[PDB]
């Protein structure tokens, strides 16, 4: 297998995983979201490449694995709400009953 041809295959596979992470059900169903998240991460761990932190921090959830999205293609919103600090700013989701807290 040519490495120049393997780079294109790697890019295509990464794009395909990232697209499968999205469309309707991974947003709707937490099971498919978590499964595809685990698959994408197991695929990116084997390629010995780090992933950007600016997306790594605020991309997915920690209990199910759905993308944090509040309210071309109308879909379902990802999070219950996003309050102010109120003591410390938190973000809640729809699928599970937990929240993620960040401090200023």
């Amino acid at each position: 297998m040519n490495k120049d041809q393997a780079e294109k295959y790697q890019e295509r596979s990464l794009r395909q995983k990232y697209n499968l992470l999205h469309v309707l059900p991974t947003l709707n169903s937490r099971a498919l979201s978590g499964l595809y998240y685990k698959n994408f991460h197991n695929s990116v761990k084997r390629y010995q490449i780090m992933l950007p932190e600016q997306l790594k921090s605020g991309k997915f959830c920690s209990h199910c694995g759905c993308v944090y999205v509040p309210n071309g293609d109308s879909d379902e919103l990802g999070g219950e709400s996003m309050e102010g600090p109120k003591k410390c700013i938190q973000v809640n989701c729809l699928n599970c009953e937990k929240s993620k807290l960040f401090e200023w």
């Binding site: 499968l20 169903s29 099971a31 084997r46 920690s62 694995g65």
Partner: protein, 251 residues
């Protein structure tokens, strides 16, 4: 050593019966060995949250499968009770009389359209399906297909040890290690299909309709689909027996 070997032989001819047995089979060691016999914080955070997400998604998939299993049974029972045959009446009746059991039911018309296209385009770009078909190479294409991902793929069971599993078409929702998960549609059938891979034959057809109406005829073998590489290469393979494929020739 020659006179020494003669002395050793004249000594062994007293104890042993064949003096030139050990020197021939190399049991008289010339040497006697004498020796006593002789930024990690965020990384750990990411590993732990990944472990937690995996452990949650497993249970979520399991309970989703169980919910679909029970919902299909209950809705088919209610349909037979109400005597309604086609799906376009049954789903509307359930929606207008049973709100809850309807948000648990899946929708094939929701599952087919983007999945099929997003997998077809991905495979077309991977196998380099071009308007002309003189730029192909079978070896590299088969290697890519062995390395390719089948998450959200359309496969048809064409041969199997069980005479009832054959002929089932479905699109992948998740790739397990022992069973294969797809979804099928019928008159009222909306069953999630789990199929064993040990002894079954699958196949996938890629449509190509630029000028003529042709398609590629590819196929996989589940029995030997368990010991393949995943997204990478360089895994030392072993010849197993190539012997339990008798069902392939038999029928």
């Amino acid at each position: 050593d020659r006179t020494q070997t003669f002395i050793k032989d004249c000594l062994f001819t007293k104890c042993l019966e064949d003096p030139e047995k050990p020197f021939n089979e190399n049991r008289f060691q010339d040497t006697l060995l004498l020796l006593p016999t002789d930024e990690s914080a965020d990384k750990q955070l990411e590993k732990r949250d990944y472990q937690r997400i995996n452990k949650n998604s497993k249970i979520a998939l399991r309970e989703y499968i169980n919910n679909c299993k029970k919902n299909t049974k209950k809705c088919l029972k209610l349909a037979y009770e109400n005597k309604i045959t086609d799906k376009e009446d049954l789903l509307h009746y359930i929606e207008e009389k049973h709100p809850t059991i309807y948000e648990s039911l899946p929708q094939y018309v929701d599952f087919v359209p983007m999945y099929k296209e997003l997998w077809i385009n991905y495979i077309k770009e991977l196998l380099n399906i071009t308007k002309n078909l003189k730029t192909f190479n079978g070896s590299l294409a088969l290697l890519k297909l062995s390395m390719a991902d089948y998450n959200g793929a359309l496969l048809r069971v064409t041969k199997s040890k069980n005479k009832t599993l054959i002929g089932l078409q479905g699109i992948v929702i998740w790739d397990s290690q022992k069973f294969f998960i797809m979804i099928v549609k019928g008159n009222i059938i909306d069953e999630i299909k789990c199929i064993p891979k040990k002894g079954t034959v699958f196949q996938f057809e890629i449509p190509i309709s630029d000028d003529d109406d042709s398609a590629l005829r590819y196929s996989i073998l589940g029995d030997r689909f368990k010991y393949r590489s995943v997204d990478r290469a360089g895994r030392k393979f072993k010849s197993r027996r190539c012997d339990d494929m008798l069902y392939y020739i038999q029928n």
